[PDB]
């Protein structure tokens, strides 16, 4: 009890939509608390990647961080299904997965076993593919050195389109594209702009392969140290900032194509059914690994 300063880490850098929302959240919090709740920000992955920061929340060394609902598959394997390529069709579908009994089951397991209290989840965009050569069809993916994050389902998307996946951390991506150490990367409409991957990538392939949410997670042990009113402020505010964040991404995702082409970017609309070819065996193994079918259930929500 007293003045409280919460520690928030993120991989996103200053000038990102994720950071602007966290700064707005920082902006909202000590305003509504009359200075008693403060939020310190640690962007650009200076504390580690999202997996490392989640581990710090579990151990009580960091208070708040971003994570996708499917990224919980690192801890709760069935949760990765929401991130399987093309299974989640849009954000509204993902939120329905996030709020179903299956979602609440994962969220409960996050809280009991890993000290993660998900306060809300926001839209962070649908991932598209950029490259140094044009990607008109899935057949053009063969032999492409495609950068992916250290995430199984981003790799799977790359593997099954026929590309050569190269997993590496988000901070190294721009330069590896500049040096053509990798031929391409895959990320959302706002991230390619904010991170300025388009400066070093002449092609963009509307592949729509993964829909990213963005959970705001607080350490449960820190949450339980708060007063009921402080919790209400934080709850009110995160939900406050999420509506803006989700809307901001939707606005940007609608306009940024007009922007990229005006920056001489070649944008291709490949036929996606052959990409949907390919995840079919991946879905079947996923259900099999887990001991219980889930992929078909999730896709139908």
């Amino acid at each position: 009890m007293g003045a409280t300063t919460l520690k928030m880490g993120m991989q996103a850098s200053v000038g990102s939509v994720e950071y602007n929302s966290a700064k707005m959240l920082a902006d909202t919090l000590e305003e509504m608390s009359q200075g008693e709740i403060k939020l310190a920000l640690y962007p650009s992955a200076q504390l580690g990647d999202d997996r490392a920061m989640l581990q710090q929340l579990t151990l009580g060394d960091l208070d708040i961080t971003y994570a996708e609902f499917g990224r919980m598959g690192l801890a709760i394997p069935r949760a990765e299904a929401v991130m399987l390529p093309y299974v989640a069709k849009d954000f509204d579908h993902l939120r329905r997965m996030f709020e179903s009994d299956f979602g609440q089951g994962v969220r409960d397991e996050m809280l009991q076993k890993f000290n993660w209290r998900a306060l809300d989840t926001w839209y962070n965009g649908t991932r598209e593919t950029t490259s140094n050569r044009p990607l008109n069809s899935i057949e053009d993916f063969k032999g492409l050195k495609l950068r992916v994050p250290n995430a199984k389902q981003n790799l799977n998307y790359a593997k099954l389109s026929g590309a050569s996946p190269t997993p590496m951390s988000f901070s190294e991506v721009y330069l590896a594209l500049q040096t053509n150490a990798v031929d391409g990367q895959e990320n959302p409409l706002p991230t390619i702009k904010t991170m300025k991957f388009y400066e070093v990538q002449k092609n963009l392939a509307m592949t729509h392969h993964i829909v990213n949410d963005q959970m705001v997670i607080i350490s449960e042990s820190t949450w339980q140290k708060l007063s009921d009113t402080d919790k209400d402020i934080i709850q009110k505010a995160v939900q406050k900032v999420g509506d803006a964040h989700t809307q901001t991404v939707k606005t940007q995702e609608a306009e940024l194509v007009s922007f990229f082409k005006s920056e001489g970017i070649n944008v291709t609309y490949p036929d996606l059914e052959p990409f949907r070819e390919a995840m079919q065996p991946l879905y079947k193994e996923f259900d099999s690994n887990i001991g219980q079918p889930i992929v078909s259930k999730l896709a139908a929500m």
């Epitope: 997996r51 490392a52 989640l54 581990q55 579990t58 151990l59 690192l74 801890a75 709760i76 076993k113 890993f114 000290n115 042990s221």
Partner: nanobody, 123 residues
Framework: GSQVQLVESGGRLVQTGGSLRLSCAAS????????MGWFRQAPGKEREFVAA????????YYADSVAGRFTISRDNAKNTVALQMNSLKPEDTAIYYC??????????????WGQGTQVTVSS
Amino acid sequence: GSQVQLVESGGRLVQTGGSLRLSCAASGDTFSNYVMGWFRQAPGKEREFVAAISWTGANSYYADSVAGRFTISRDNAKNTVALQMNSLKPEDTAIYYCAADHFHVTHRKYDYWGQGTQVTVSS
């Protein structure tokens, strides 16, 4: 197949000041998905955390009782975790347990556990 099976080896009678390497073999689910930990138990007590190592080996955690003396390491090709014990003292006599979990945790016990391996340190 989601569960992990663990088998420790290395337990011996050793001398004060001696060094001993424990090894643990993991099977079942994908080894690199798990933080690997070492715990030890004397009768009556609960278990002491000894050491833990992250998925890639980049992060490792140690108890103050063994920090500087013990070293934990893993091999994701052999699916093994090892605990190198140096400067062993009698307080360290215990059954040492290999454990696996998706994340390092302190508010609860790890999900998966080995049969236990006995370490005896003589004065």
